[model samples]
Target: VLSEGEWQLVLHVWAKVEADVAGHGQDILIRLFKSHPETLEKFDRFKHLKTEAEMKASEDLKKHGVTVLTALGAILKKKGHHEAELKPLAQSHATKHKIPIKYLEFISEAIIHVLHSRHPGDFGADAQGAMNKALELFRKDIAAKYKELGYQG
Candidate 1:
């Protein structure tokens, strides 16, 4: 539930991020992998890429990055209406990958960091807080589905 002001801030940041989705999205994934290498292990196709350069050069990784950003862009566009949209993704990641909800939480930090890094002076504390709240809502939507499937985490 974002306040009206918060929604505006998020949309502003997202607009900038989405404008260069190829760059920012890949950078976000690179940051996430560098910070949490274990996250990369889940991708069988990408598991062999040992360096950031290798990952970046991969057409597969590029497509995946775009796909992730596209979904996130859709989530943002839904204007805080996300649960129904997130259900199938939540179900697959929960039931198939058995991903811990915490990992989803971890990605929120990466997203915020990316947003701040890309926007620099434009992204301030208020924007950070807004994005944090929004991401928490997104994570909760997925976690709720996981819980429905008997995942305690």
Candidate 2:
């Protein structure tokens, strides 16, 4: 189990990643891969980073952002709610993108791992809510994408 400090780190990264996606683009992950260039193996579409570099960049995001976002790391770590927290994010992604729910769930799990490394705490259930919001926003984005492409899912 992670300590209080560790949990804080986890949520910090989670919050930042979402916020970044909100402000920039979902392709933020792609940007992350580009900067590192070693994360490619872990990702299919964002074939940018090598394994080690990808790992490091993700770790950096967690350490830098968790508690700064809202002390979620500490609260969640204490609750041991990692998997529970990630499920909603995954479900939302799957529902919005017409992708397999498990794929997004796995992605959310990987993200939680990244958070754990950074915060050393529980991400708690915060990601569930945040990811839910992300999904809804993504759904809108997808609708726009389909509108532009003249296709439906």
Candidate 3:
């Protein structure tokens, strides 16, 4: 759980990047794919776009990135609302894509990387740690939902 100060930091920091949701989403997704190319296998269409340039040039990839970021933005806006928002998506991923909860957890790392990269000086250890904990809570909620769906993965 975030302290009042940490929560305030989250609200403030997220608001700063929310304006360019598309751009920020694209950057985070691209960085995620580049760092863990295997995760791209989750997307039949994106799996082939191995290189960063190739991924950036694809409209489909951009659209998916925007979708992810948009959902995350909405979740961040409403405190304690992430589980309600993420559960259905987690169910879909498990039922449709058969995506494991572990891979889904990668969003935390991707978010942290992009946030730190974008706001270098402002995003200090305290903020990063708080964000990490918050993201972990999200991951736990998603994982629980996935499991409840009886997803083998």
Candidate 4:
């Protein structure tokens, strides 16, 4: 949840950099697994891909990696103006999907790292600085929803 002005700039930068954007999502998710193999086990679809090599090779990984970025983009477009957009998703993850909060936090870090590594020129300090704040709010916002839904863990 960036300030009004910050959201505008973030979006502006996104548009300017639109010529590219999933090698990123996939790379980020893959990095997250490498950084924290425990997370890979959390996903039923991925847990079976036990070895790092299999984890990297799965088409399922690619699909979910694509999903994460697309979903994040949707959230960014709403820019927190759309309340409850993340609520249902939070409920789903918290109750049914039961994804750990740490994974959520970790992926945000991975996104910044991956984006910076892949698009150093386009995703400069200003963009990353703003994104840092934006993701903080995003995590908090989702976590809050989870808490409200009785996800005490």
Candidate 5:
């Protein structure tokens, strides 16, 4: 449902966060590329990445910690793998490593928060469909990935 642009941002955010959690800088992107090389189309910002835009965008959301937690939760949910204790781990890891999910309630928070910070005037109205779309895109991506892995997840 998400527009291609929104989906790209979600994936970019997810990839980066996942990489950090795995203690593998940019490795998620590398693995993704290795697994699905054509996905490079989604990383236009990376290929010819604009420095200011990247910083502003990241700052617009305050360092991207929330997205990291949300994405980690997403992947773990799919893999049926998680450390024994959930809340404590999420909170501890989030705080200990500067990851923040304090104000985040869902994955859509990224778009909503970023839009509100960057384009406050129209963010509320502009973000509804896009947020919904982003969530849908995530669901679709996970469904597809698991299907490909022959996982009914």
Candidate 6:
């Protein structure tokens, strides 16, 4: 969905993101859960944490952040080429993980929120546009998978 030039801009953003994927991923995930505490139920490891402070301190959450970032790394590095992975991955999320497709937007907002907060100068309009574009493509694919996999909600 991205032109080669656009891919380059996404790569530029990756330079900052790759340096601290875990840190950024953690921030994004925490912000998402903090804003929508009800989403906590989706995370078995974190559902027991009654407070945001406890969430901040979870090694398990940190690991999941790393996982999110790692998955994203593959997507972004390849410039939004993850068709093979998205099928099974989204099927699992639909039938097993049971993540609401709506949370995809929530997570994207959290990701943009974190990047903008942390990198004021570098994460400008162009970079933001690139990342947003990239995520929408992935989000659309996964949401379709959700529908296809019989996710009732």
Best by lDDT: 1
Deviation of model 2 at 31, angstroms: 13
- The C-alpha stretches of model 6 lying farther than 4 A from their native spots are none
Model 5: CA > 4 A from native: 1-106, 109-120
The lDDT of model 1 is 0.84
Q: What would the per-residue lDDT of candidate 6 be over residues 1-153, giving only the tens digit for each residue?
A: 789877887788778888987788779988998888777778887888877788778888888999888887787776767888798779878888888878888889998899899988988998899888888888888887777778844
lDDT per residue for candidate 2 within 1-153, as digits (tens), equals 444544455445455555543222223333444443443344353344345455445544444334323333333433354444444433443354344333333434444444444444434466444443443433444444444443433
Off by over 4 Å in 1: none
lDDT score, candidate 5: 0.41
**Comparing 4 and 6 on TM-score, the stronger one:** 6
Residue-pair clashes per prediction, in order, are 0, 24, 0, 0, 0, 0
* C-alpha lDDT of residue 30 in model 4: 78
lDDT of 2 at 24: 24
| Per-candidate alpha-carbon RMSD to the true structure | 1.1, 11.8, 1.7, 2.3, 15.6, 1.5
Q: How many backbone clashes does candidate 5 have?
A: 0
RMSD of 6: 1.5
Model 1 lDDT-worst window of ten? 144-153
The CA lDDT at 145 in model 6 is: 75
Pairs of residues clashing in candidate 1:
none
Q: How far in Å is the alpha carbon of 52 misplaced in model 1?
A: 1.1
TM-score comparison, 1 vs 3, better candidate: 1
lDDT of each: 0.84, 0.41, 0.79, 0.75, 0.41, 0.83
Model 5, range 17-110, lDDT digits (tens) per residue?
Answer: 4444432223333333344444433444444433434433443223334444555546434333333324343444344333223222233444
- What tens-digit string does per-residue lDDT give for candidate 4 at 7-81? 875776556334444466567877898888887777877777666678667877877877777777777778776
